[PDB]
């Protein structure tokens, strides 16, 4: 009579690594590094905007592409590569900082700044901003002299933020193709735009000159922005080449912004995103995208790291 103590084993052994051995067989193991991707944006439970052709910064100035998003609201914001912040050729100064701000704004609430003008045209328009016919940015006013070559009077407009949150203020400087064109629009002489706050002070001059044609146009409108503290005021002194704002922006709350090139899905529920889709996993690590955002597992170089979930596999002596 005889009694033996033993432990189970398989022929279906899977190799793992330890401190000492490399490829020691265990009975059972599981993966710790996610590689399984969902090529969609799982948006269930989250208010989502697919800006598409509307560049995120375009939601503030308002080219035609962004007309639907002028006062949008979201929990998740999706930028698209075909997006554009611009109709009339140009770019923001400190663009990326502004994007990072708007990506977690929860959307924007617009408010009239209430500027009034005299002895001046405000109907500045272009073929590039076609909305039915020639037009311009929806939240801005392209200011001209009055007739042609006429003198542009010095002006000084101010706006106070009477709200409990900081106000996104945006203005533009226009750079004509030539001094001949700058003169035709705003009259002769050097042009200066000054912008004053209570924690901000800058100065701006147009730079007329030949440039490559973008959208058929060699002129550039470069945008500038600041955040106006509550109860503080901004003041705009200028005498031409100035793109005045009509409204200010206020951040709605909290959101998250991503860039992607895949479709959205309102049935799937996720919280970790990259440009190629959504990562849903309880695994501690992932090997999909180093730049993945949201609440994600840590990114690693390795594609696989097997965790032993069973004892060492020792074959039976036949």
């Amino acid at each position: 009579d005889k009694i033996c103590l033993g432990h189970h084993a398989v022929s279906n052994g899977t190799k793992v690594n330890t401190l000492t051995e490399r490829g020691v067989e265990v009975v059972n193991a599981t993966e710790t590094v996610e590689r399984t991707n969902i090529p969609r944006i799982c948006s269930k439970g989250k208010r989502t905007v697919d800006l598409g052709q509307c560049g995120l910064l375009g939601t503030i100035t308002g080219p035609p592409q962004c007309d639907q998003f002028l006062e949008f609201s979201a929990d998740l914001i999706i930028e698209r590569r075909e997006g554009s912040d611009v109709c009339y050729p140009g770019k923001f100064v400190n663009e990326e900082a502004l994007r990072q701000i708007l990506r977690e704004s929860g959307g924007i609430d617009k408010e009239a700044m209430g500027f009034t003008y005299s002895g001046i045209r405000t109907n500045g328009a272009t073929s590039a901003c076609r909305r039915s016919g020639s037009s311009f940015y929806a939240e801005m006013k392209w200011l001209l002299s009055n007739t042609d070559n006429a003198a542009f009077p010095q002006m000084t407009k101010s706006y106070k933020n009477t709200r409990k949150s900081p106000a996104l203020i945006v203005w533009g400087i226009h750079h004509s193709v030539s001094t001949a064109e700058q003169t035709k629009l705003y009259g002769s002489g050097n042009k200066l735009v000054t912008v004053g706050s209570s924690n901000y002070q800058q100065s701006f001059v147009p730079s007329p000159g030949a440039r490559p044609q973008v959208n058929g146009l060699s002129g550039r409108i470069d945008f500038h922005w600041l955040m106006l503290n509550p109860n503080d005021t901004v003041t705009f002194s200028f005498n031409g080449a100035f793109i005045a704002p009509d409204r200010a922006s206020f951040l709605r709350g909290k959101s998250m912004g991503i860039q992607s090139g895949v479709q959205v899905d309102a049935n799937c529920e996720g919280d970790c995103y990259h440009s190629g889709g959504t990562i849903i996993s309880n695994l501690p690590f992932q090997n999909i995208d180093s730049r993945a955002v949201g609440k994600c597992p840590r990114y690693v170089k390795q594609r696989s790291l097997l965790l032993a979930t069973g004892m060492k596999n020792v074959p039976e002596i036949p």
Partner: protein, 169 residues
């Protein structure tokens, strides 16, 4: 037609447990699994699993742009920081898994010893080790007696006379 326990081999036929008993008497050969040691080992492994499932509440947002590249200097600083961090987590992950697996394997062996040691202490002076993970029982142990061992109700006092007699001569 002999049988052998742990020490150079596992049992591919043990399919209802991790650790178990295998005996042979006049009634033939039999194999049963031990619950307590099996569950203890399973509790410890799943314990590690739940620990590695503990998600983070740290949210991270975009710091650069893959449509419109950021400025070179700050862009290279960012890539340098992320790559450095990635190197750190890759190292941690490699070490964590390697360290865990070494421990998972060792605690599995540990449970095997404890079971073997428990049975040895049940049998007292009525059995001897064969060196293959088995015990040579120096008395008649029918299927009922073998079951008494598996459920820790084996009273060595009952068999002590017959056993020591057979052991000595």
């Amino acid at each position: 037609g002999a049988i052998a326990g742990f020490i150079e081999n596992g049992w591919e036929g043990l399919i209802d447990g991790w650790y178990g008993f295998r005996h042979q008497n006049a009634q033939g050969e039999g194999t049963a699994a031990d619950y307590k040691s099996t569950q203890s080992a399973i509790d410890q492994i799943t314990g590690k699993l739940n620990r590695l499932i503990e998600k983070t509440n740290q949210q991270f947002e975009l710091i650069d742009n893959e449509f419109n590249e950021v400025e070179k200097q700050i862009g290279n600083v960012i890539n340098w920081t992320r790559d450095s961090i990635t190197e750190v987590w890759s190292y941690n992950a490699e070490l964590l898994v390697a360290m865990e697996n070494q421990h998972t394997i060792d605690l599995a062996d540990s449970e095997m010893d404890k079971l073997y040691e428990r049975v040895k202490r049940q049998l007292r002076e009525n059995a001897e080790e064969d060196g293959t993970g088995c015990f040579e029982i120096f008395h008649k142990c029918d299927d009922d007696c073998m079951a008494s061992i598996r459920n820790n109700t084996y009273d060595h006092s009952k068999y002590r006379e017959e056993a020591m007699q057979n052991r000595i001569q």
